């Protein structure tokens, strides 16, 4: 017994018409700020019925999950547990996700590359900064 109205082939939350074929709450892994533990805990604590079908999802579920990603404090996530915890420039604890400027907030590399620190002076030429021994190896993508 399925819901016969409003049903869309595409599961739409963030206004980017990705393929809605994927089952519920598994398509939010592409957001640059919510992933791994955070995304999984906020779908598993959202009380979702993963045994439901694509044509039996309801507007209540999508509305509630939209509200839950809008509000970071739906279940009192700690600040050290928060995604943008004590980030540079400004300290914001609100769960906001929009294209155009979020990745620029993630781009705190401006300062590190400008002050030409040790990591910056490495990155001037494109040298590794995590100890990967690539003395002459590294043929993946370098022909």
């Amino acid at each position: 017994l399925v819901i016969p109205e409003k049903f869309q082939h595409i599961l739409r939350v963030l206004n980017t018409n990705i393929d809605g074929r994927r089952k519920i709450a598994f398509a939010i892994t592409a957001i640059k700020g919510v992933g791994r533990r955070y995304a999984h805990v906020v779908l598993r604590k959202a009380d979702i019925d993963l045994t439901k079908r694509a044509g039996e999802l309801t507007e209540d579920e999508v509305e509630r999950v939209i509200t839950i990603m809008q509000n970071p404090r739906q279940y009192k996530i700690p600040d050290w547990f928060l995604n943008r915890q004590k980030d540079v420039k400004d300290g914001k604890y609100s769960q906001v996700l929009a294209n155009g400027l979020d990745n620029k907030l993630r781009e705190d590399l401006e300062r590190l590359k400008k002050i030409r620190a040790h990591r910056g002076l490495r990155h001037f030429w494109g040298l590794r900064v995590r100890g990967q021994h690539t003395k002459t190896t590294g043929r993946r993508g370098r022909t």
Partner: protein, 72 residues
């Protein structure tokens, strides 16, 4: 190299799972996903609902191996 299945609601909602399957001698969720291009969630839900209806005989279960047949 590419193969696509269907998770939409069509004749697969009722047909070939509510009245045509009992003609078989053995049912397997992989066989259902072969004959109808479905997923594991649908296979488990359909088996549970059909068993609640009462036309199916259990064999055993596993995380990826749950076996049933027909008896009516």
């Amino acid at each position: 190299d590419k193969l696509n299945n269907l998770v939409l609601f069509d004749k697969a909602t009722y047909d070939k799972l509510c009245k045509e399957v009992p003609n078989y001698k053995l049912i397997t969720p992989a066989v259902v996903s072969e004959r109808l291009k479905i997923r594991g969630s649908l296979a488990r839900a359909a088996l549970q609902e059909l068993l609640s209806k009462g036309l199916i005989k259990l064999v055993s279960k596993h995380r990826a191996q749950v076996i049933y047949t027909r008896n009516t």
